[PDB]
Amino acid sequence: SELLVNTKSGKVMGTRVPVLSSHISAFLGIPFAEPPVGNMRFRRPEPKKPWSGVWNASTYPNNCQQYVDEQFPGFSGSEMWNPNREMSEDCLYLNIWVPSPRPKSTTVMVWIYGGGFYSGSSTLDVYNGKYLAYTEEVVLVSLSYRVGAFGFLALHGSQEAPGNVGLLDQRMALQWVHDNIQFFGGDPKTVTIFGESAGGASVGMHILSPGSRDLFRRAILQSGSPNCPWASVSVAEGRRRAVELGRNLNCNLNSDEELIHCLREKKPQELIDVEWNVLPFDSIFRFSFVPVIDGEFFPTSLESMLNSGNFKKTQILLGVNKDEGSFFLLYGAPGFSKDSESKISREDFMSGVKLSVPHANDLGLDAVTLQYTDWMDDNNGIKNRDGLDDIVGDHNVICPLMHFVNKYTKFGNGTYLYFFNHRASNLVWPEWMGVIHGYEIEFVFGLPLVKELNYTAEEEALSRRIMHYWATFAKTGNPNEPSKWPLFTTKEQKFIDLNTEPMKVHQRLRVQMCVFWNQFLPKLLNAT
Ligand SMILES: *[C@@H]1O[C@H](CO)[C@@H](O[C@@H]2O[C@H](CO)[C@@H](O)[C@H](O)[C@H]2NC(C)=O)[C@H](O)[C@H]1NC(C)=O
Numbered sequence: 001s002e003l004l005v006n007t008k009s010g011k012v013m014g015t016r017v018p019v020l021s022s023h024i025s026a027f028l029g030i031p032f033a034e035p036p037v038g039n040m041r042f043r044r045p046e047p048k049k050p051w052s053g054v055w056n057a058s059t060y061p062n063n064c065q066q067y068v069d070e071q072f073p074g075f076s077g078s079e080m081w082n083p084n085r086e087m088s089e090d091c092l093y094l095n096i097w098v099p100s101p102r103p104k105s106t107t108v109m110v111w112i113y114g115g116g117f118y119s120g121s122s123t124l125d126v127y128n129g130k131y132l133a134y135t136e137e138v139v140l141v142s143l144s145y146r147v148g149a150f151g152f153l154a155l156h157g158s159q160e161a162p163g164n165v166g167l168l169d170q171r172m173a174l175q176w177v178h179d180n181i182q183f184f185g186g187d188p189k190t191v192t193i194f195g196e197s198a199g200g201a202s203v204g205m206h207i208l209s210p211g212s213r214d215l216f217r218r219a220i221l222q223s224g225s226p227n228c229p230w231a232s233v234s235v236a237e238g239r240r241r242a243v244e245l246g247r248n249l250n251c252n253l254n255s256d257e258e259l260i261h262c263l264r265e266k267k268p269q270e271l272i273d274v275e276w277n278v279l280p281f282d283s284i285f286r287f288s289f290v291p292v293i294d295g296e297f298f299p300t301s302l303e304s305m306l307n308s309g310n311f312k313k314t315q316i317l318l319g320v321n322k323d324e325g326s327f328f329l330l331y332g333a334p335g336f337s338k339d340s341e342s343k344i345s346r347e348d349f350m351s352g353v354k355l356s357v358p359h360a361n362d363l364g365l366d367a368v369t370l371q372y373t374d375w376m377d378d379n380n381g382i383k384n385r386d387g388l389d390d391i392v393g394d395h396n397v398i399c400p401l402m403h404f405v406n407k408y409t410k411f412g413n414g415t416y417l418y419f420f421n422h423r424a425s426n427l428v429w430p431e432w433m434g435v436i437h438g439y440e441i442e443f444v445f446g447l448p449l450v451k452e453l454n455y456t457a458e459e460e461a462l463s464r465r466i467m468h469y470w471a472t473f474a475k476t477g478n479p480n481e482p483s484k485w486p487l488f489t490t491k492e493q494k495f496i497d498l499n500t501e502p503m504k505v506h507q508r509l510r511v512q513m514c515v516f517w518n519q520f521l522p523k524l525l526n527a528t
């Protein structure tokens with residue numbers, strides 16, 4: 001049977017699913033680790049003990065325990081990101097979509113979801129692999145991995161909660177693909193990993209970690225990079241936040257062992273109810289438990305790894321959206337709201353900046369402000385709102401990604417860079433938010449080919465160029481079929497737009513602002 005597949009861990013059974021008036025196979029909720037429950041919480045994951053009999057991979061798995069967005073109850077723009085399945089600590093599962101009939105040795109793509117490391121699911125409507133699998137004829141995997149404190153609580157020195165274990169979940173799912181994807185028609189020596197926001201950062205991190213490098217061929221990074229200022233923390237800061245976590249639950253804090261024990265007796269939702277209380281600053285685009293620079297997963301600092309070429313040398317394709325910052329301002333900066341044009345007063349601007357660059361002294365805040373203010377029009381609310389938007393997106397997503405790409409290109413084997421800027425015609429979020437964090441995903445996953453969803457036809461077309469670029473790049477290391485997407489080179493710095501208008505090629509993507517965030521501001525804060 002096409003739906004029966006024998007693997008190194010045991011036999012697995014899927015289900016046919018319809019797709020654009022056809023069918024393909026899906027193997028959903030296949031385990032790739034032991035359940036990290038009980039005395040195993042905060043622990044490195046363990047390989048799943050094989051089973052006999054036939055694994056029922058006919059329905060989606062649980063989602064990992066996570067914080068749930070309730071800012072806009074009943075609003076689909078936010079609610080479609082929340083878990084749509086029971087949450088549980090038993091969540092290390094992966095999902096495969098296989099073309100029909102079964103390929104013999106086709107290109108494999110493994111999706112890693114984002115969510116600032118505090119949230120995410122493999123099972124969401126926008127991550128449905130059937131459209132991609134079917135249209136581009138690739139085997140589509142999506143893995144899953146522990147988030148929040150379950151995935152990233154870090155007491156360096158302990159072996160009970162070493163940190164990074166979420167990153168280790170990902171690696172195991174990738175071990176399992178390397179090992180078993182052949183039986184599903186996938187080619188394990190042509191796996192592309194790809195992800196968005198924390199998933200984009202994750203991909204960069206697997207490119208840097210020596211223990212992950214041999215497990216995939218190429219990489220795609222959407223709106224996220226390993227060196228993002230929100231994507232990792234030192235062992236001191238992780239230790240400090242773990243303890244503070246404990247302090248919020250009245251734990252015995254006299255030893256690592258005492259503390260971990262107390263955290264392990266707590267119901268999942270107790271950890272989640274206080275997770276946000278440990279940020280050391282009042283801040284937007286910052287998350288409590290994220291990877292740590294431990295000297296193990298990351299052997300030294302990301303920056304020295306990047307300067308010295310200590311990382312997997314291969315092809316990568318990556319990019320950003322035009323308005324990355326607006327979500328975070330909506331959720332936290334005063335002046336902003338879902339149902340108003342959100343025009344921002346000088347006073348609210350000043351506090352936006354302080355929230356966006358939480359680690360800056362007054363002199364740094366002055367410099368961000370000078371840099372983003374039209375002084376011949378300082379009382380324009382649209383200008384204040386948009387400048388704040390650019391500050392969040394430049395500092396947190398674009399300038400870090402440009403730094404990474406600039407360093408990667410000096411040693412890598414080919415880079416392709418995009419700037420995604422089409423606002424969907426069916427978008428339910430307000431006009432002022434722009435081309436928003438997270439909204440290229442539905443193009444990359446091909447949702448605009450389902451008519452019930454209400455995209456224009458030029459949107460269906462764009463979605464098809466994107467999938468074919470992503471897939472062709474995954475299959476060959478070049479998104480071009482033999483009008484060009486040129487290579488990004490350190491000399492010329494070219495990239496493309498991605499939108500309904502015919503494509504153009506540009507250069508030096510936000511250099512002016514990124515020289516400020518990557519060279520000047522860091523220097524200024526080192527000195528003062
Ligand atoms: C990626 O690496 C490939 C393979 O190593 C490079 O192709 C080589 O280019 C060198 C330098 O010009 C030539 O001497 C060889 O003939 C090529 N070798 C092979 C096996 O083709 C390729 O240039 C690299 N691409 C980029 C953009 O760096």
Ligand SMILES: *[C@@H]1O[C@H](CO)[C@@H](O)[C@H](O)[C@H]1NC(C)=O
Pocket residue numbers: 056058059
């Ligand atoms: C498991 O598969 C059976 C058929 O083998 C099917 O009834 C169902 O899709 C699965 N179980 C449920 C309902 O969770």
Ligand SMILES: *[C@@H]1O[C@H](CO)[C@@H](O)[C@H](O)[C@H]1NC(C)=O
Pocket residue numbers: 452453454
């Ligand atoms: C497409 O159009 C209809 C009719 O206005 C709208 O109500 C419907 O919900 C749309 N489809 C979705 C799920 O948005």
